[PDB]
Design a binder for these strands. Structure first.
Ligand SMILES: [Mg+2]
Ligand SMILES: [Mg+2]
Ligand SMILES: [Mg+2]
Ligand SMILES: [Mg+2]
Ligand SMILES: [Mg+2]
Ligand SMILES: [Mg+2]
Ligand SMILES: [Mg+2]
Ligand SMILES: [Zn+2]
Lengths: 114, 139, 119, 56
RNA sequence: AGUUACUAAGGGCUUAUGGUGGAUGCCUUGGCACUAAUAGGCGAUGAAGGACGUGUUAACCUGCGAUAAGCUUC
RNA sequence: GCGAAACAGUACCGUGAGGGAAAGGUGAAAAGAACCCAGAGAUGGGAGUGAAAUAGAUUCUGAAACCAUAUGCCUACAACGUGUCAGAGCACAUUAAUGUGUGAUGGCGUGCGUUUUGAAGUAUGAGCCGGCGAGUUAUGAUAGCAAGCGUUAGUUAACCA
RNA sequence: AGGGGUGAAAUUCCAAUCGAAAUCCGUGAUAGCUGGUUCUCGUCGAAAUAGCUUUAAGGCUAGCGUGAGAUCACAAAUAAG
RNA sequence: UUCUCGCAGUCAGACAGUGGGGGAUAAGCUUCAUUGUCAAGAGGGGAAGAGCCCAGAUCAUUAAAUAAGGUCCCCAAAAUA
RNA sequence: UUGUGGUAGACGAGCGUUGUAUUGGAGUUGAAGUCAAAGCGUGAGCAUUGGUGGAUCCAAUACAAGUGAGAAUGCCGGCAUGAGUAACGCUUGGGAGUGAGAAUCUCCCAAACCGAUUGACUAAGGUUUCCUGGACCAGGGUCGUCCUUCCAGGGUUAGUC
């Protein structure tokens, strides 16, 4: 018994090529390059799915530092004024968003002054 | 309302025919026949005859207006090739490949004629989604 | 590279000039390349101007240039010149010929030009 | 001297940008009607109002 | 003094088409390997293999041999 | 699959022994596309036959690499293993989904197999696409698992029908 | 006419090839030596040392991995004395 | 990690700390004993580094506290004396 | 509750393909194959709709294997890039004619090389290349109305060579 099987190979390569669309040049045409680029893209996806929560926290810190620097104290002093006194688990983003709807944030920053 | 005309396996290159086909495309027919006759190219004596034949096909067969015509869309697709051997120093026998071109010229009558192809494109997906939806009634 | 054609040696240029002036006097029109026509015109004009006096010195000086053609032989072409072509132009200061450009050739896309001469 | 890396379909198309042709100047001979390329004699054999050739 | 839509010689991405090109799929007067019977040779009465020729018909293939794409007889 | 589905041991290479290929499919049936227009003509476009002429003699289907055309978006101060995570504006509208295509701009980012102590590698393999292509078989040995049969057990080989 | 020939000798020439022609066959020669060896998910997870080796780019046994089974307290680990 | 049975792989190692040989208290040198790491292992620090320091990735989260290292801007984070 | 990085390497469970067997069943009211789409799965992989296409095929359980391709300076076919780049392999000017079309063909006139030869006769070879008429798929390093190419017809005549 002889088995040729050109169906399965083409279907597999078609899936790999379909994965990489919107790629420059031949990367979406030739399969040999498409597989390399899909592998590399998924590596980058795995690394960035961690780097982005590494970075968004930093952005929230930055936009909280800026808001507090216009009241007379720094972010590195505000965190004490949440943990030790008036123990609060308000998150590190929402205290950021509260500036985009301000004058409810000022209530926070003057509440810890007690 | 297109009335094309095609010549197959002309002994010209595809890449030399595309140079004058660019000259002729999008322009009106009165300033295409003459502008193509007057240019000094091998790819022009081979397209003047074809363009005039397309003119005659449009005018006789389909029955369009004539002085409303314009060259809708021009190409020189790759026709079949010929493979030949060429001697060399010390007998190494490179392969010369003679080219060819399947010229085709389309002559539209109404100035737009392009949104209609898009309309057919959109219908061909509208009916796909519609057949998809009518088969969601599997309950 | 090595073995190469003799090419457009100066003798080739001058002999082409002689043949073309013979041909233009014989018939009265030439259909040649433009950039040989502009070069033939000078010698044409010089001959016709040198040929209005008809002494034997002018016959000798023109014998140095002409060649026989199918229409006229050289000693017939000399008489044909000095009898009807040269005296016709005797009052025109310069401007004995014109070179007008034809259409490009199919073989080479060279700029064909016609050389002729009329009053 | 050879290429070390194949010049893709992108670099090649960019090079041919300057290859486009020019539409040669066209005039309309008086004494008959037709589009002779300018500064030539049309197939009439007439250049302007002067005759330089045969019928065609 | 300053802000910013438009350009695209040409390129890039997607989507649709057209051309070359002939893989995948269906098929086959073909091959492969075997079984059961039969038979296990042809040849100076000139073989095997070949040339050459023959037509109402060009060439080629086939059949055939100056009785020559056929003759006799049951 | 015989080297060979067809005029194959042909064409072809070689002085010679000898070496030695590739390619098939219209349609049910030629009803093989009279006639007209353009053209020198092949041919093409209508007509006509036919279920279909995107079946037209390039003849079953007709992917990919590859070459051209086009709607939509971006690009002419910009350092780029060419993608990813964010993200504007723009244009559309689906295997109805916290949707689709492009993606000005920020952060981040030295390919794949191989062999090597260690390669982005100034080490090597691959131009690209498709197809073909590499731990099987006979007869015995031991081990694991399962089954039949069993305490004077178990078990057939050749051969014959 | 080839484990031959020819050579005013050079390892010359022997059908564009000659430190011993060309093609066929044994023949799928052998190669501790390069290169290649094609589908997925889960569990566990090393060595690059010792002895010997006409051995040192390889091989055998021990050492180290894994699977199946037993030992289950006196065996093996980890701290103090 | 002891014993028996099946199945292999491996025998070209590298660097940093420590104690010495050869070396010239020279080598990213060579040869050993030892502790790690890499190999066969990603993340953060180190500007960039296979082998150093911290650590040991099932996958998603635009959640919180930390280790080494670090807080003028690039680059997230600090002030007083 | 303890865990879940991992090459060589041991072990386990699995997807897919081709065919056979029985069991169900779909198909010209359009089967497989092929492209396209904004689906579903932990993965190998699997559906749905539409265009094309024009006759076989899908699922369940076992069974048997030419059973699964990105690499072998792999084999075969196609196609790019380099590139419309180098090359085009010793020589002219014109008149008249033909023809749809001429540098390139026919005639004429010169012109330029050969001349112990590019001349004339034959042997060896080659095997119709010779002559006339016609054609311009391919070959001609361009073109071509023309060729030593192709097609139809033709030609080789010995007592003494
Ligand atoms: Mg290199
Ligand atoms: Mg250019
Ligand atoms: Mg692999
Ligand atoms: Mg190299
Ligand atoms: Mg160049
Ligand atoms: Mg150059
Ligand atoms: Mg050149
Ligand atoms: Zn005119």
């Amino acid at each position: 018994m002889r088995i040729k099987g050109g169906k399965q190979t083409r279907v597999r390569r078609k899936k790999w090529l379909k994965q990489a669309s919107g790629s420059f040049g031949t990367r979406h045409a030739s399969y040999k390059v498409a597989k390399q680029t899909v592998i590399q893209a998924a590596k980058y996806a795995y690394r960035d799915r961690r780097n982005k929560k590494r970075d968004f926290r930093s952005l929230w810190i930055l936009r909280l530092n800026a808001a507090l620097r216009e009241q007379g104290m720094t972010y590195s002093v505000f965190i004490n004024l949440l943990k030790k006194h008036n123990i609060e688990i308000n998150r590190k983003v929402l205290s950021e968003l509260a500036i985009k709807e301000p004058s409810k944030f000022n209530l926070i920053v003057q509440k810890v002054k007690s | 309302m297109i009335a094309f005309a095609k010549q197959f396996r002309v002994r010209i290159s595809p890449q030399k025919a595309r140079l004058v086909c660019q000259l002729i495309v999008g322009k009106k027919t009165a300033d295409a026949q003459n502008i193509l006759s007057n240019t000094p190219k091998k790819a022009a004596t081979l397209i003047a005859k074809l363009l005039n034949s397309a003119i005659a096909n449009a005018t006789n067969n389909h029955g369009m207006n004539g002085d409303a015509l314009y060259v809708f869309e021009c190409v020189a697709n790759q026709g079949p090739s010929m493979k030949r051997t060429i001697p060399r120093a010390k007998g190494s026998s490179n392969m010369i490949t003679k080219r060819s071109s399947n010229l085709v010229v389309k002559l539209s009558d109404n100035p737009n004629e392009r949104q209609e192809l898009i309309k057919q494109q959109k219908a061909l997906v509208k009916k796909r989604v519609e057949g998809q939806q009518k088969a969601k009634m599997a309950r | 590279s090595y073995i190469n054609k003799p090419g457009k040696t100066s003798a080739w240029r001058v002999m082409t000039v002689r043949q073309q002036v013979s041909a233009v006097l014989a018939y009265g029109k030439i259909e040649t390349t433009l950039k040989k026509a502009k070069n033939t015109q000078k010698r044409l004009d010089k001959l016709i101007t040198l040929a209005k006096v008809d002494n034997f010195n002018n016959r000798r000086q023109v014998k140095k240039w002409l060649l026989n053609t199918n229409l006229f032989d050289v000693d017939q072409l000399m008489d044909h010149l000095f009898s009807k072509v040269a005296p016709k132009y005797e009052k025109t200061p310069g401007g004995y010929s014109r070179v007008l450009k034809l259409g490009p050739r199919r073989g080479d896309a060279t700029e064909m030009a016609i050389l002729q001469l009329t009053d | 001297a050879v290429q070390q890396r194949r010049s893709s379909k992108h670099r090649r198309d960019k090079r041919r940008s300057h290859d486009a042709l020019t539409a040669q100047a066209l005039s309309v001979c008086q004494k008959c009607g037709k589009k002779k390329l300018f500064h030539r004699v049309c197939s009439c054999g007439m250049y302007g109002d002067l005759r330089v050739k045969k019928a065609y």
